[PDB]
Amino acid sequence: TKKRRNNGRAKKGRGHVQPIRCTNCACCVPKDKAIKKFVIRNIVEAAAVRDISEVSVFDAYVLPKLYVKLHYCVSCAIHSKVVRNRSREARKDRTPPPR
Amino acid sequence: MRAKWRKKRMRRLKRKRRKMRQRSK
Amino acid sequence: MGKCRGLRTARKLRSHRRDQKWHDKQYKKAHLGTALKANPFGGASHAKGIVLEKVGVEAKQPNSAIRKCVRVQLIKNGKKITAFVPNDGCLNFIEENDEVLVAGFGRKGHAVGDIPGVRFKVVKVANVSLLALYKGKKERPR
Amino acid sequence: GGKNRRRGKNENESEKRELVFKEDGQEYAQVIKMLGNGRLEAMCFDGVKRLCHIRGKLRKKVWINTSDIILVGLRDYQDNKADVILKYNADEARSLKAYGELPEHAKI
Amino acid sequence: VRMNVLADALKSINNAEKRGKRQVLIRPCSKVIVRFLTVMMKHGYIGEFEIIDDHRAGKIVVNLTGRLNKCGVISPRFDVQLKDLEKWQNNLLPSRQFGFIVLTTSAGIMDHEEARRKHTGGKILGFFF
Amino acid sequence: VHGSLARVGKVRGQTLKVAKQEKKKKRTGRAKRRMQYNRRFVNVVPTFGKKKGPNANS
RNA sequence: ACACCAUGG
RNA sequence: CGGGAAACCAAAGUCUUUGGGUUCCGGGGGGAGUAUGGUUGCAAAGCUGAAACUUAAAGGAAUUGACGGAAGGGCACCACC
RNA sequence: CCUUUAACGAGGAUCCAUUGGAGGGCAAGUCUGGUCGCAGCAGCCGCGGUAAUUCCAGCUCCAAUAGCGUAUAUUAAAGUU
RNA sequence: UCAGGGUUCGAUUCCGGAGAGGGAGCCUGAGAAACGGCUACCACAUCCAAGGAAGGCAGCAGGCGCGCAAAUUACCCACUC
Ligand SMILES: [Mg+2]
Ligand SMILES: [Mg+2]
Ligand SMILES: [Mg+2]
Ligand SMILES: [Mg+2]
Ligand SMILES: [Mg+2]
Ligand SMILES: [Mg+2]
Ligand SMILES: [Mg+2]
Ligand SMILES: [Mg+2]
Ligand SMILES: [Mg+2]
Ligand SMILES: [Mg+2]
Ligand SMILES: [Mg+2]
Ligand SMILES: [Mg+2]
Ligand SMILES: [Mg+2]
Ligand SMILES: [Mg+2]
Ligand SMILES: [Mg+2]
Ligand SMILES: [Mg+2]
Ligand SMILES: [Mg+2]
Ligand SMILES: [Mg+2]
Ligand SMILES: [Mg+2]
Ligand SMILES: [Mg+2]
Ligand SMILES: [Mg+2]
Ligand SMILES: [Mg+2]
Ligand SMILES: [Mg+2]
Ligand SMILES: [Mg+2]
Ligand SMILES: [Mg+2]
Ligand SMILES: [Mg+2]
Ligand SMILES: [Mg+2]
Ligand SMILES: [Mg+2]
Ligand SMILES: [Mg+2]
Ligand SMILES: [Mg+2]
Ligand SMILES: [Mg+2]
Ligand SMILES: [Mg+2]
Ligand SMILES: [Mg+2]
Ligand SMILES: [Mg+2]
Ligand SMILES: [Mg+2]
Ligand SMILES: [Mg+2]
Ligand SMILES: [Mg+2]
Ligand SMILES: [Mg+2]
Ligand SMILES: [Mg+2]
Ligand SMILES: [Mg+2]
Ligand SMILES: [Mg+2]
Ligand SMILES: [Mg+2]
Ligand SMILES: [Mg+2]
Ligand SMILES: [Mg+2]
Ligand SMILES: [Mg+2]
Ligand SMILES: [Mg+2]
Ligand SMILES: [Mg+2]
Ligand SMILES: [Mg+2]
Ligand SMILES: [Mg+2]
Ligand SMILES: [Mg+2]
Ligand SMILES: [Mg+2]
Ligand SMILES: [Mg+2]
Ligand SMILES: [Mg+2]
Ligand SMILES: [Mg+2]
Ligand SMILES: [Mg+2]
Ligand SMILES: [Mg+2]
Ligand SMILES: [Mg+2]
Prior knowledge:
The structure is cut from a larger assembly and holds chains A, B, C, D, E and F. In chain A, 10% of the residues lie in helices and 22% in strands. Chain A is α+β, with helices and mostly antiparallel strands. Chain A starts with 18 loop residues before the first strand and ends in a 20-residue tail after the last helix. Chain D has a single domain (1-108), classed as CATH 2.40.50.140. Chain D is 8% helix and 21% strand. Chain D has 1 helix and 5 strands. Chain D has a 5-stranded mixed sheet, with no helix packed on it. Chain D has one helix spanning 90-98, and strands at 26-30, 43-44, 51-54, 69-73, 81-87. Chain F contains 2 helices and no strands. Chain D binds chain F through residues 23-26, 55, 73-77, 83, 85, and chain F through 1-8. Chain C binds 4 RNA strands through residues 2-6, 9, 17, 20-21, 23-27, 30, 32, 34-35, 38, 41-48, 62-68, 75-76, 87-89, 101-108, 110-114, 117, 120-121, 123, 131.
């Protein structure tokens, strides 16, 4: 029987949306049905930041961030534990998880 | 698939038979 | 979700019903005629035939037996049909190459019970009943 | 063999297996080749083929594997068909061949 | 596109009595609807009602009591012949002790218990019970 | 097992024969109905709630 | 941050 | 609100208290979108479309188990280190 | 022929009621003997593999009754046209 | 057969039509394209002295054939006409 009110997809009032390739599977999924993730992380790791901030040539240097936007097929997003299957009525929560 | 391939097999047999019939006459 | 309701639509209603009757199996075979043309009887209740030979057919699982049938060729058509013999030990009354009167089985076209593809049953062997040949009320004319 | 199925009553065949000879309308045969649907070809010890059928009492119980001695019942009115009544151990098969029961025609 | 104006009026009154309202607005209106509501009022199934002029088809406000149970329209105005009237009031009505078939006749818009009295049939409009 | 397994009429032949034992001419017609009414309605000697059938044996 | 895992009186 | 076999639907509601208007189309499961005739197409194919025969079920929503080379907690030297 | 009438004409062992059933649908036996997935029954679900309420028979019981069973066409059941 | 609506049947004693093996042509008569009338072809079939002649039960009985499927080669104008 039907499992989602929105068919597991965002499209309403539209015929087609251009696809997009997964980032590990290289599959080919609609841009509104893919699973997105913005990632902002330091170019250094948190273990290293006290060593690199110690041998700068300059006195004040705030290291750069790495901005990346990722898209996942559903099979690969479930295999990499990005999302998990949820209870039947607990499936209708749209708020993102608490930080 | 099994509906897809059933359809495909029937199509290829139909082609072979039509060819045989219309080449006989 | 829509059926014309207006006051002069009778032609549409009648011509549409007359069409949709043809999807009802039980009506279709009464009126195409291809059933009556294909019927191994003549469209009658009974038919005479001559016993070609005696066979046994293994019943359809789970239950198991060998079901003791004649194979007959009918007089009027000349076409060949298999028929059941209806009681314990009757297959000894049926000599070979005598006549018989076969009848229907009971579901109007279809094999009854566990027997695979037998649709008729015997009533008379040689102008004497099976029910009398078997209950003792009569004996074979020879 | 070897399954979960200890559910059916155990073999207990160790008790007193006799010997069994022909009758009217019974005869020994050998298995030529097996066919689907359960029924199998046969070859009796006089020449008829009698495309033979496994009786309901033997269904998935005694395995009539290829090329062994069998006992079949004939039909009173049909000859090209028969039904397996019994399978012999190689012990009974030699016992019958020596006893002067089955012909010195076919091998085991 | 609004082929039948009496059908809307009776469906509108009916969708609101079930809800429990006390007044309903009907729009458009006609001589036919006004005659029908009069038959429904002489018998006590609705209260008095008020017609609004607006220089077009007007609107009606009707005061409902709870006594009404159903009213409806028979969509093709079939003919009825006073010998086929029983076969109608036995299919449409819930019991022979109440309820009315409303039909239009040469002597006006009336209810079958009066058409029998004046010996005339005509065209069926609806029913209320 | 012996003979043809397919031997026709096996059980009807090997069943041992027994004659009809009776003499008593049964009743017929109205007089039979007169019987069934009396036995089913006139005297029904009272019993526990676990009621019994007219041919009971067990 | 994925070698291979078929079958059942 | 009400409806439904229920999942569910502000329409899939206003339906045994059954009739606003009109178009297409279904009639147990298979044989089968097959055979054949017509037609369109360079071709691949599309449109229209049977019967013989065979069968007591095939199916839909939901419930409790059992299983998973599915996920989250937890446990045992008849499990491991 | 029927009707009207003399003379013969009833003790029940005949001046003899049959046809189909007895697991369910569906009124009536968890009797006794026989057969052993055989012979068979069964419109449908299903009975029979050595302890058969369903097969073959005795006994008893059920339904209609001077009638009852079977095959077939058709109508209601079918709001399954 | 049927609540209401309907479905199926109507060779069959009353009324109308059509036909006497198949097709065709005509005489006589108020009335016939008549077959218990005639002529010819087609298909059947009978008698013969081998020259010739003769025929029409889908009237009543009866017989063969066909098939699952249908009564006696009886009596009489007394009744209706
Ligand atoms: Mg699913
Ligand atoms: Mg838009
Ligand atoms: Mg849209
Ligand atoms: Mg699309
Ligand atoms: Mg169709
Ligand atoms: Mg069918
Ligand atoms: Mg494994
Ligand atoms: Mg294998
Ligand atoms: Mg395999
Ligand atoms: Mg809303
Ligand atoms: Mg809304
Ligand atoms: Mg909304
Ligand atoms: Mg709607
Ligand atoms: Mg509605
Ligand atoms: Mg409406
Ligand atoms: Mg179908
Ligand atoms: Mg199949
Ligand atoms: Mg199909
Ligand atoms: Mg189609
Ligand atoms: Mg074609
Ligand atoms: Mg065309
Ligand atoms: Mg073409
Ligand atoms: Mg179609
Ligand atoms: Mg079955
Ligand atoms: Mg399901
Ligand atoms: Mg886990
Ligand atoms: Mg421990
Ligand atoms: Mg261990
Ligand atoms: Mg260790
Ligand atoms: Mg009896
Ligand atoms: Mg019986
Ligand atoms: Mg009995
Ligand atoms: Mg019963
Ligand atoms: Mg009962
Ligand atoms: Mg015993
Ligand atoms: Mg016993
Ligand atoms: Mg017993
Ligand atoms: Mg009907
Ligand atoms: Mg039907
Ligand atoms: Mg009627
Ligand atoms: Mg007539
Ligand atoms: Mg006729
Ligand atoms: Mg007649
Ligand atoms: Mg006439
Ligand atoms: Mg006239
Ligand atoms: Mg004739
Ligand atoms: Mg004259
Ligand atoms: Mg003439
Ligand atoms: Mg005449
Ligand atoms: Mg003449
Ligand atoms: Mg002549
Ligand atoms: Mg004549
Ligand atoms: Mg005659
Ligand atoms: Mg005859
Ligand atoms: Mg008759
Ligand atoms: Mg006859
Ligand atoms: Mg006279």
